[PDB]
A paper describes a structure:
In order to reveal the atomic-level details of co-translational folding, we determined the structures of a series of nascent model peptide with increasing amino acid length. For this study, we chose the human Pin1 Trp-Trp domain (WW domain), which consists of 35 residues, as our model peptide. The topology of the WW domain composed of three strands and two beta-hairpins, which form an antiparallel beta-sheet. The structures of the intermediate-length (WW11-MBP, WW17-MBP, WW19-MBP) and full-length (WW35-MBP) WW domains, which are fused with MBP at their C-termini, were determined with X-ray crystallography.
Residue numbers in the entry: 8 to 389
Write the structure that this text describes.
């Protein structure tokens, strides 16, 4: 009864699900996938190996599902935080760059893709949220979160608003939650403590309460998502937004005269955005691991490869030492680094998936009023 009702009963996955002799790459739709496809086409021109870049919706949830059956892309791009879960499930190949190649990338970026002593992805770029502001509406961005309500009252009189950003993904609210003490998992003595979650302490509660108060006082709307905030800022309807380097391209196209700067402080403390390392993992069921290695090491992670992607959508602070130096001049990147400094590198442990889902629910429910801050964060905690 037990076996025969389960899909696992005498189950052997089919062969040839992932096509040998080509590369399929998944990357998020807010990244420079058209630029990545340019690198892929160069690879095809040189080597005859076709590269297909796709940007599926919710790829970070689709990948573990399809890869578990030996299907999916040869290469998956995502922030490093999801990869430990993939690795634990046996979905990622350990990557084997030689010492010469490892020397080309910053050591801390290799650390972000290390799991149980193994490298499980290639690091590409360091991402951190910054405060983005309309210099025409706001020549001087606020130093503190606390002064934003007063700013909104000013701009509401002019038919504008102070601030809009994605409230549907907890990634964007985390800088405020972590500012005065909130944390995900406590890193102590070489390991994250999965029983030590800091989403319901005094600091986290204070931060989320300030967010909820902004909404209660009609300075923000609870259902604002990525597209709503991006559209509003790039139309010049709101003075500020919170976003990463990938967003700069659309603002460059917009008519907005904008700047990128340090996130405001909360209770005198710097906002602490979670830092992500955009990373490329190789599917453990791929028959093309040698092709993937060649593409990633000798085509993408070069000055020419990163330039192609960066020209589509800015990567931020790239992990490649040689190319990072060329872009260090950019004040937007400098601001990105400053915020990344003040923040924390995301854990990559398998528990991150559940953590993000819990905090997503908590932030959405607190913001919309489905739950109080105390109720919401209590649930998020273990
Ligand atoms: O909001 C939870 C979400 O946060 C992070 O995702 C970021 C990603 O790192 C960025 O590159 C960009 O695409 O925005 C995303 C948020 O919408 C985590 O990496 C992710 O695992 C988590 O679910």
């Amino acid at each position: 009864w037990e076996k025969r009702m389960s899909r696992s009963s005498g189950r052997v996955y089919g062969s040839g699900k992932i096509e040998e002799g080509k590369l399929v790459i998944w990357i998020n739709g807010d990244k420079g996938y058209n630029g990545l496809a340019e690198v892929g086409k160069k690879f095809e021109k040189d080597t005859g190996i076709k590269v297909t870049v796709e940007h599926p919706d919710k790829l970070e949830e689709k990948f573990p599902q399809v890869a578990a059956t030996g299907d999916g892309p040869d290469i998956i791009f995502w922030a490093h935080d999801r990869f430990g879960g993939y690795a634990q499930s046996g979905l990622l190949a350990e990557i084997t760059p030689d010492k010469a190649f490892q020397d080309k990338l910053y050591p801390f970026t290799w650390d972000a893709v290390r799991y149980n002593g193994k490298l499980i992805a290639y690091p590409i770029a360091v991402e951190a949220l910054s405060l983005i502001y309309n210099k025409d509406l706001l020549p001087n961005p606020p130093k503190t979160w606390e002064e934003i309500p007063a700013l909104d009252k000013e701009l509401k009189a002019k038919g504008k608003s102070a601030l809009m950003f994605n409230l549907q993904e907890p990634y964007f609210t985390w800088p405020l939650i972590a500012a005065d003490g909130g944390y995900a998992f406590k890193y102590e003595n070489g390991k994250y403590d999965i029983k030590d979650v800091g989403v319901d302490n005094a600091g986290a509660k204070a931060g989320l309460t300030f967010l909820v108060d902004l909404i209660k006082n009609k300075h923000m709307n609870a259902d604002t998502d990525y597209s709503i905030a991006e559209a509003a800022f790039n139309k010049g309807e709101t003075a500020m937004t919170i976003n990463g380097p990938w967003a700069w391209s659309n603002i460059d196209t917009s008519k907005v005269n904008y700047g990128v700067t340090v996130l405001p402080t909360f209770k005198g403390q710097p906002s602490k955005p979670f830092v992500g390392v955009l990373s490329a993992g190789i599917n453990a069921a791929s028959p093309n691991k040698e092709l993937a290695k060649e593409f990633l090491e000798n085509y993408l992670l070069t000055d020419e490869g990163l330039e192609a992607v960066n020209k589509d959508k800015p990567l931020g602070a790239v992990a490649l030492k040689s190319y990072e130096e060329e872009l260090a001049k950019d004040p937007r990147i400098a601001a990105t680094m400053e915020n990344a400094q003040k923040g924390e590198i995301m854990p990559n442990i398998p528990q991150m998936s559940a953590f993000w889902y819990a905090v997503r629910t908590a932030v959405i429910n607190a913001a919309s009023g489905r739950q109080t801050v105390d109720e919401a964060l209590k649930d998020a905690q273990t």
